[PDB]
Amino acid sequence: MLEKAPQKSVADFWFDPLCPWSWITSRWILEVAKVRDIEVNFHVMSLAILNEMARAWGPVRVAIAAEQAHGAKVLDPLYTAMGNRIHNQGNHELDEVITQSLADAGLPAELAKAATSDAYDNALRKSHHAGMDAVGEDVGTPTIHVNGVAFFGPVLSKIPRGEEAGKLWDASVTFASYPHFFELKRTRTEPPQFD
Amino acid sequence: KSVADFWFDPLCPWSWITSRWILEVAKVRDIEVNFHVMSLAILNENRDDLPEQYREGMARAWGPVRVAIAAEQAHGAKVLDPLYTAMGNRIHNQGNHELDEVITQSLADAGLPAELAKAATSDAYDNALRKSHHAGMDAVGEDVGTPTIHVNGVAFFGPVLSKIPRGEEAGKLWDASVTFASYPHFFELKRTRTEPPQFD
Ligand SMILES: [Cl-]
Nearest by CB to residue B150, choosing from A152, A160, A191, is A191
**Alpha-carbon gap, residue A163 to A134, rounded angstroms:** 31
- HSE of A91, CA atoms in CB hemisphere, 13 A: 18
Beta-carbon count within 10 A of B55 CB: 9
In the A/B pair of chains, how many CB contacts fall below 8 A?
166
- How would you classify the pairing of strands B2-8 and B31-37? parallel
Interface of B with A in 173-192 (CB under 8 A): 173, 175-177, 179-181, 183, 185-192
Query: Residue A17 in contact with residue A86, Cβ under 8 Å?
Result: yes
Q: Is the peptide bond before B159 cis (omega within 30 degrees of 0)?
A: yes
| Nearest CA distance, B25 vs chain A (angstrom) | 14
The one-letter code for the residue type at A86 is I
The verdict on a CB contact (< 8 Å) between A153 and B183 is: no
Beta bridge partners of A12: A41, A145
Query: Residue B87 in contact with residue B15, Cβ under 8 Å?
Result: no
Cα-to-centroid distance, B189 and ligand 1 (Å): 15
DSSP B47-98: -TTS-GGGGG-HHHHHHHHHHHHHHHHHH-GGGHHHHHHHHHIIIIIS----
**Alpha-carbon gap, residue B92 to B144, rounded angstroms:** 22
DSSP A133-186: -TTS----SSEEEETTEEEEEEEESS---HHHHHHHHHHHHHHHH-TTEEEEEE
Query: Residue B122 in contact with residue B66, Cβ under 8 Å?
Result: yes
DSSP annotation of B116: G
Q: Resolution of the coordinates in A?
A: 2.0
* Chain-centroid distance, C-alpha B9: 4
**Alpha-carbon gap, residue A73 to A67, rounded angstroms:** 7
- Please give the sequence-ordered ranges of beta strands (E in DSSP) within chain B, or none if there are none: 2-8, 31-37, 140-141, 148-151, 154-161, 186-190
The one-letter code for the residue type at B88 is G
- Please give the sequence-ordered ranges of beta strands (E in DSSP) within chain A, or none if there are none: 9-15, 38-44, 143-146, 149-156, 181-186, 189-190
DSSP annotation of B143: -
Q: Which residues contact A93 (CB under 8 A, 6 or more apart)?
A: none
Query: Residue A147 in contact with residue A10, Cβ under 8 Å?
Result: yes
**Alpha-carbon gap, residue A44 to B128, rounded angstroms:** 52
**Alpha-carbon gap, residue A141 to A164, rounded angstroms:** 22
Nearest by CB to residue B189, choosing from A2, A178, A184, is A184
Beta-carbon count within 10 A of A39 CB: 12
Interface test with A, best of B133, B154, B157, B192 (most A CBs within 10 A): B192
Q: What is the C-alpha R_g of chain A?
A: 18
Q: Which residues contact A59 (CB under 8 A, 6 or more apart)?
A: A16, A17, A18, A82, A86, A94, A97, A98, A115
Q: What is the C-alpha R_g of chain B?
A: 16
Q: How was this structure determined?
A: X-ray
**Alpha-carbon gap, residue B33 to B5, rounded angstroms:** 6
Cα-to-centroid distance, A47 and ligand 1 (Å): 9
| Interaxial angle between packed helices B99-109 and B80-88, expressed in degrees from 0 to 180 and rounded to the nearest 10 | 140
Burial class for A157, CB neighbours closer than 10 Å (0-12, 13-18, 19+): exposed
Nearest by CB to residue A184, choosing from B159, B172, B198, is B159
| Nearest CA distance, B101 vs chain A (angstrom) | 31
The verdict on a CB contact (< 8 Å) between B179 and A168 is: yes
**Alpha-carbon gap, residue B36 to B160, rounded angstroms:** 18
Q: 3-class SS at A129?
A: helix
Nearest by CB to residue A185, choosing from B183, B188, B193, is B188
**Alpha-carbon gap, residue B103 to B113, rounded angstroms:** 11
Domains located in chain A, CATH noted: 1-195 (3.40.30.10)
Beta bridge partners of B149: B6, B156
Nearest residue on chain A to B178, alpha-carbon basis: A171
Interface test with B, best of A180, A188, A193, A195 (most B CBs within 10 A): A180
Beta bridge partners of A152: A143, B190
Query: Residue B70 in contact with residue B90, Cβ under 8 Å?
Result: no
